[PDB]
Design a protein around this ligand. Structure first.
Ligand SMILES: CC(=O)N[C@@H]1[C@@H](O)[C@H](O)[C@@H](CO)O[C@H]1O
Length: 243
């Protein structure tokens, strides 16, 4: 069970400032919601030895902290204490509707980034809602109004391979075997390939990038909290994005 690796105190010490009034998602993300959701995904934080389960959770909270960070360079307790500050895409996001007969856009509904993985677009809310048996296509606001659902979308993303792009789960648990194409593209198992899976088109293969360095900093802080050392191949600066 995942609760033997991650306690309420480890969750709270990682997500130290999420409940500050400056965070729009303050009061949303609970340890209970996380454990309820985690238990629905067989293998999630229960694959491998203790250090491998710790590493998976460090990596999962690292990446999701980046997706939702409200941190700045000089924030209280540093930038890597301000994960899980947002539950919806910032700026003025549009409806993120790309029509699908399989996963049709609901009238008046918007599919902008919500929750810990910032799940976006009607196609993804529909694929996800099918997998977790929730009406995300008709009510995408559930991902920001129900914290158990919010965590389910992020773990769903984390556990789901995309053809030649592995699950974050496989990579974080040392179960990803890189293809010859992967090797030629510099995609060596590590946290960097996880950044590549999540947003490599934007962030990877272009040299030093502050968003990548941010993802690493969260993961480094959380490895410390779990009492493990970070893995190798932390960045994707010299990785070709997954096409
Ligand atoms: C609202 C919040 O607490 N945090 C920050 C904001 O103040 C910050 O300066 C900027 C990037 O550093 O984006 C937000 O996420």
């Amino acid at each position: 069970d995942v609760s033997s690796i991650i306690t309420s105190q480890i969750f709270n010490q990682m997500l130290l400032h999420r409940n500050d009034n400056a965070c729009p998602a303050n009061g949303f993300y609970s340890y209970q919601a996380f454990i309820n959701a985690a238990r629905k995904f067989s293998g999630f934080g229960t694959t491998g030895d203790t250090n491998t389960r710790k590493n998976e959770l460090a990596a999962f909270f690292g990446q999701t902290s980046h997706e939702t960070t409200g941190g700045w360079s000089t924030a209280p307790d540093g930038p890597y204490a301000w994960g899980y500050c947002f539950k919806q895409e910032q700026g003025n996001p549009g409806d993120y509707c790309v029509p699908s007969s399989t996963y049709p856009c609901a009238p008046g509904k918007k599919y902008y980034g919500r929750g810990p993985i910032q799940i976006s677009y009607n196609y993804n809310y529909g694929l996800c809602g099918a997998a977790i048996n929730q009406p995300l296509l008709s009510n995408p606001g559930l991902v920001a109004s129900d914290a158990d659902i919010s965590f389910e979308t992020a773990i769903w993303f984390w556990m789901t391979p995309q053809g030649n792009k592995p699950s974050c789960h496989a990579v974080a648990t040392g179960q990803w075997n890189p293809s010859s194409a992967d090797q030629a593209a510099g995609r060596v198992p590590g946290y960097g390939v996880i950044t590549n899976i999540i947003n490599g088109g934007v962030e990877c293969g272009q040299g030093e990038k502050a968003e990548v360095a941010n993802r690493i900093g969260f993961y480094q802080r959380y490895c410390s909290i779990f009492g493990i050392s970070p893995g190798q191949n932390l960045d994707c600066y010299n990785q070709r994005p997954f096409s």
